[PDB]
Enzyme design. Structure first.
Site, PDB file in Angstrom:
ATOM      1  N   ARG A 154       0.829  -1.195   0.000  1.00  0.00           N
ATOM      2  CA  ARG A 154       0.000   0.000   0.000  1.00  0.00           C
ATOM      3  C   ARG A 154       0.870   1.255   0.000  1.00  0.00           C
ATOM      4  O   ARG A 154       2.027   1.223   0.423  1.00  0.00           O
ATOM      5  CB  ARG A 154      -0.939  -0.011   1.208  1.00  0.00           C
ATOM      6  CG  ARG A 154      -1.929  -1.174   1.192  1.00  0.00           C
ATOM      7  CD  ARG A 154      -2.869  -1.140   2.382  1.00  0.00           C
ATOM      8  NE  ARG A 154      -2.165  -1.453   3.620  1.00  0.00           N
ATOM      9  CZ  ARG A 154      -2.045  -2.669   4.147  1.00  0.00           C
ATOM     10  NH1 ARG A 154      -2.594  -3.733   3.565  1.00  0.00           N
ATOM     11  NH2 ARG A 154      -1.368  -2.813   5.276  1.00  0.00           N
ATOM     12  N   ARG A 193       0.782  -0.395  20.073  1.00  0.00           N
ATOM     13  CA  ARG A 193       1.478   0.672  20.783  1.00  0.00           C
ATOM     14  C   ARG A 193       2.039   0.146  22.099  1.00  0.00           C
ATOM     15  O   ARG A 193       1.320   0.044  23.093  1.00  0.00           O
ATOM     16  CB  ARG A 193       0.534   1.846  21.044  1.00  0.00           C
ATOM     17  CG  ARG A 193       1.223   3.087  21.585  1.00  0.00           C
ATOM     18  CD  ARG A 193       0.218   4.125  22.054  1.00  0.00           C
ATOM     19  NE  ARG A 193      -0.092   3.989  23.480  1.00  0.00           N
ATOM     20  CZ  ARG A 193      -1.314   3.869  23.999  1.00  0.00           C
ATOM     21  NH1 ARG A 193      -2.399   3.860  23.232  1.00  0.00           N
ATOM     22  NH2 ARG A 193      -1.451   3.755  25.312  1.00  0.00           N
ATOM     23  N   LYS A 195       3.150  -9.551  10.729  1.00  0.00           N
ATOM     24  CA  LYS A 195       2.464  -9.531   9.438  1.00  0.00           C
ATOM     25  C   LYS A 195       2.667 -10.832   8.665  1.00  0.00           C
ATOM     26  O   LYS A 195       3.766 -11.127   8.195  1.00  0.00           O
ATOM     27  CB  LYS A 195       2.945  -8.351   8.591  1.00  0.00           C
ATOM     28  CG  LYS A 195       2.083  -8.097   7.357  1.00  0.00           C
ATOM     29  CD  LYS A 195       2.796  -7.233   6.326  1.00  0.00           C
ATOM     30  CE  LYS A 195       2.725  -5.757   6.671  1.00  0.00           C
ATOM     31  NZ  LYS A 195       1.347  -5.223   6.509  1.00  0.00           N
TER      32      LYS A 195
END
Ligand SMILES: Nc1ncnc2c1ncn2[C@@H]1O[C@H](COP(=O)(O)OCCCCC[C@@H]2SC[C@@H]3NC(=O)N[C@@H]32)[C@@H](O)[C@H]1O
EC number: 6.3.4.15
Length: 304
Positions: free
Chosen positions: A116, A301, A181
């Protein structure tokens, strides 16, 4: 021209040692030319072991995509199996005028695979699944969120069905395993609208592969299943929208009730995810208040 390296990897795929001499005889070429083309395979990401003075061998056999086997078990659309392409998404885009909903494309190797926002997707030969599918929506969507969620849900569920129990989805368009991922989804949009869906799933090859988690799937079987389920799933989305996918999303939501960071434009905001609403917008809780979001890149986070 890629015919000679392709014939070369076709021979070497079985994992057996071939001499430079016999490869030359078989392919009607000199041993120097063979040595040249072996190097091309290495450029494509193929792990090739050289036996000095004797010949070549893959360290292990690799399973090559079998078009006849993949096509044979599917129905309702064309499927193109490409040894070498620039991008399976681009291949379908180049012909977006002659395609029907469900037409798919699979590549062994992408020379210009992209992620992307102009990023690149490393797509070595034979190591992973690079799949794309065309679809036409009679009424154009206002955003790509709904579609991405449907794709992510289906591909996750398929992988889970095949033994990858812990695969989850990252809103709205990545599959994650152990918070890493595993697979990337790229939806490209163009009254109606034309859609080219792109999925890259790491199998053998920050990131994570199926093999690194002890999952060894048949690449042909995986390709067929994904194509089969995506077609039916996109029909369902076409007819009923995101509604029948909402509960199915909750089971796969990798970041629900977790502290996340959202990169939107060039702003970076913090909050806790509360899942999605009925439109697939991310429900981000900031300072006790929940706001919907139809964009941005989400990520964990933590300084752990
Ligand atoms: N194999 C990889 N695995 C994990 N991380 C990687 C990989 N390659 C590159 N990356 C990293 O991720 C970024 C790009 O991934 P993405 O933008 O999340 O992109 C997400 C959407 C990916 C779509 C890829 C499919 S493949 C078939 C189809 N054809 C095509 O050109 N794209 C799609 C790069 O900056 C790089 O650091």
């Amino acid at each position: 021209d890629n015919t000679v390296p392709l014939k070369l990897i076709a021979l070497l795929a079985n994992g057996e040692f071939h001499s430079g001499e016999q490869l030359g005889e078989t392919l009607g070429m000199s041993r120097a030319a063979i040595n040249k083309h072996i190097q091309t395979l290495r450029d494509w990401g193929v792990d090739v072991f050289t036996v000095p003075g004797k010949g070549y061998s893959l360290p292990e056999p690799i399973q090559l995509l079998n078009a006849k086997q993949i096509l044979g078990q599917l129905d309702g659309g064309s499927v193109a199996v490409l040894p070498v392409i620039d991008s399976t998404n681009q291949y379908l885009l180049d012909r977006i005028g002659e395609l029907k909903s469900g037409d798919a494309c699979i590549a062994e190797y992408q020379q210009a695979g992209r992620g992307r926002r102009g990023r690149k997707w490393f797509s070595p030969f034979g190591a992973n699944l690079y799949l794309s599918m065309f679809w036409r929506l009679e009424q154009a969507p206002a955003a790509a969120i709904g579609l991405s969620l449907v794709i992510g849900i289906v591909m996750a569920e398929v992988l889970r069905k095949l033994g990858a129990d812990k695969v989850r989805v990252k809103w709205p368009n990545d599959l994650y395993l152990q918070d890493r991922k595993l697979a990337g989804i790229l939806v490209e949009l163009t009254d109606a609208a034309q859609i080219v869906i792109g999925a890259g799933i790491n199998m053998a090859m920050g990131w994570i592969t199926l093999q690194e988690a002890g999952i060894n799937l048949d690449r042909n079987t995986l390709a067929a299943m994904l194509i089969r389920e995506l077609r039916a799933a996109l029909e369902l989305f076409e007819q009923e929208g995101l509604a029948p996918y909402l509960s199915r999303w909750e089971k796969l939501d990798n970041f629900i009730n977790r502290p996340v960071k959202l990169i939107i434009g060039d702003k970076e905001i913090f909050g806790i995810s509360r899942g999605i609403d009925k439109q697939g917008a991310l429900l981000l809780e900031q300072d006790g208040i929940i706001k919907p979001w139809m964009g941005g890149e989400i990520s964990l986070r933590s300084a752990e």
